[PDB]
Amino acid sequence: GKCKDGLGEYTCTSLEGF
Amino acid sequence: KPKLLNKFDKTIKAELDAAEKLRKRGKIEEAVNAFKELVRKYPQSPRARYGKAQCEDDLAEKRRSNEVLRGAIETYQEVASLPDVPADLLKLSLKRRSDRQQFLGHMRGSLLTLQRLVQLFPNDTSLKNDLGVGYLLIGDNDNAKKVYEEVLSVTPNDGFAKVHYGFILKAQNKIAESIPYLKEGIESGDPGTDDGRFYFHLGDAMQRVGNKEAYKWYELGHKRGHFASVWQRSLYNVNGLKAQPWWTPKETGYTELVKSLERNWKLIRDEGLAVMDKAKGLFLPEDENLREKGDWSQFTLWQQGRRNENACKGAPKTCTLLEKFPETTGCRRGQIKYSIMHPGTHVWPHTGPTNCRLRMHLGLVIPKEGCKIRCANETKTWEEGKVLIFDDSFEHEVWQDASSFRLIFIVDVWHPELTPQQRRSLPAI
Numbered sequence: 227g228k229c230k231d232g233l234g235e236y237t238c239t240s241l242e243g244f
Numbered sequence: 245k246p247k248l249l250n251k252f253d254k255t256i257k258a259e260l261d262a263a264e265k266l267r268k269r270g271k272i273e274e275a276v277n278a279f280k281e282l283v284r285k286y287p288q289s290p291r292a293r294y295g296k297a298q299c300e301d302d303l304a305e306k307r308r309s310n311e312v313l314r315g316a317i318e319t320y321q322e323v324a325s326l327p328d329v330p331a332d333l334l335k336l337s338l339k340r341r342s343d344r345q346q347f348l349g350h351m352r353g354s355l356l357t358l359q360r361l362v363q364l365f366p367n368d369t370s371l372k373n374d375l376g377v378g379y380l381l382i383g384d385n386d387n388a389k390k391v392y393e394e395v396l397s398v399t400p401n402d403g404f405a406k407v408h409y410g411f412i413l414k415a416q417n418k419i420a421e422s423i424p425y426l427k428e429g430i431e432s433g434d435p436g437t438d439d440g441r442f443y444f445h446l447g448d449a450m451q452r453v454g455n456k457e458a459y460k461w462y463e464l465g466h467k468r469g470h471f472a473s474v475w476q477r478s479l480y481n482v483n484g485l486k487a488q489p490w491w492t493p494k495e496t497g498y499t500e501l502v503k504s505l506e507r508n509w510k511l512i513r514d515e516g517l518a519v520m521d522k523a524k525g526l527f528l529p530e531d532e533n534l535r536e537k538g539d540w541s542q543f544t545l546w547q548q549g550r551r552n553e554n555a556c557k558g559a560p561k562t563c564t565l566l567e568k569f570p571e572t573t574g575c576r577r578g579q580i581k582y583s584i585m586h587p588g589t590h591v592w593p594h595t596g597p598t599n600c601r602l603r604m605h606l607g608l609v610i611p612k613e614g615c616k617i618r619c620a621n622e623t624k625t626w627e628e629g630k631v632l633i634f635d636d637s638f639e640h641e642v643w644q645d646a647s648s649f650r651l652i653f654i655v656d657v658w659h660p661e662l663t664p665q666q667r668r669s670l671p672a673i
């Protein structure tokens with residue numbers, strides 16, 4: 227699930243460390 | 245102060261203290277040698293193994309290398325595998341393992357550790373809260389909900405468990421029920437409750453039910469540093485970028501893109517209408533709970549800076565036209581999509597996730613009356629063959645009360661003040 231028009235997911239990005 | 249040394253570790257506390265001292269003095273490589281030395285000589289020592297892990301952690305920080313940190317994650321696990329591990333050390337080791345797994349994006353691995361932690365320490369309420377986060381991070385809100393329900397069944401005034409339960413409820417469109425949890429959780433002031441997400445969604449929930457106190461919470465969220473303003477409430481922002489709800493083509497500097505869109509608009513329209521007639525399924529219903537009522541669907545060509553090749557089969561000339569403008573086709577925090585909206589549609593006041601994009605609206609099929617879009621405090625209308633531009637990180641609202649359908653073309657662009665390296669590095673949304 228991705229945040230496209232809104233902010234409904236708990237987190238909208240995928241993290242990759244440093 | 246935690247008890248980290250089992251019976252045998254206290255007999256060697258001298259050597260372990262000396263190795264730790266080297267790590268806290270910053271001499272990091274000296275410290276790993278010391279701890280790998282102790283690990284060889286005392287292979288069952290949990291503290292020596294924990295020390296090796298911590299030093300690998302510090303070393304990854306100094307080098308900023310995910311490489312090194314993946315090693316620390318296995319050593320943290322090695323600690324828990326050893327005999328006679330003190331409970332405090334066992335919990336510290338596996339928690340840092342889960343935290344660093346999340347730092348790396350290994351959300352399914354972090355979840356596995358969290359589940360282990362909860363079984364080992366079944367009376368620790370804080371770890372069940374952490375476990376719920378692990379579920380949320382993989383998109384498993386069903387299990388996240390049950391976790392926070394159990395937490396509330398034992399410690400019903402746990403603020404952290406309240407906001408996250410409210411967040412889950414609101415995401416499932418149980419708006420009224422969400423409000424008390426979000427509100428009471430923010431007011432508890434517990435650690436983890438001062439988060440923009442919960443201000444954002446409490447205010448939205450209040451707006452949807454007509455509660456006029458909503459901007460009371462947007463105000464406080466602005467005062468506490470989560471929102472750039474009470475009107476612009478995006479949460480994935482590059483601070484400093486010029487903020488205003490509406491823009492002109494010159495103000496963005498994307499004047500060639502705008503010209504290309506307006507000069508070739510009938511072509512863009514015709515390919516969208518062709519998909520409506522012969523490939524209806526490519527239009528997907530809006531699935532973010534942004535509608536009060538009505539029908540609203542989008543046909544997406546680019547998302548997160550990725551061309552959808554099957555989608556572009558249906559708008560081939562449009563996709564070819566757009567390929568000339570990397571400011572949009574390379575905008576990994578926006579989309580390019582057709583958007584159709586039918587009469588009887590009202591889109592709730594809402595905000596986009598990021599201030600790092602601007603949103604262009606090209607009019608394709610616009611009824612003479614009944615369609616309008618508000619952003620901040622100015623409301624405007626679409627025109628066939630003309631481009632509107634607004635910053636959708638500001639609150640915006642849309643109505644459709646015409647007697648026929650309304651079709652527009654949406655083109656997101658990087659905020660113009662973002663630098664080439666920013667556009668190349670910022671995580672996609």
Ligand SMILES: O=C(O)CC[C@@H](O)C(=O)O
Nearest residue numbers: 231583585603636642654
């Ligand atoms: O599709 C539309 O009509 C506009 C929707 C609006 O929320 C947007 O982000 O552009």
Ligand SMILES: [Mn+2]
Nearest residue numbers: 231596636640
């Ligand atoms: Mn929107």
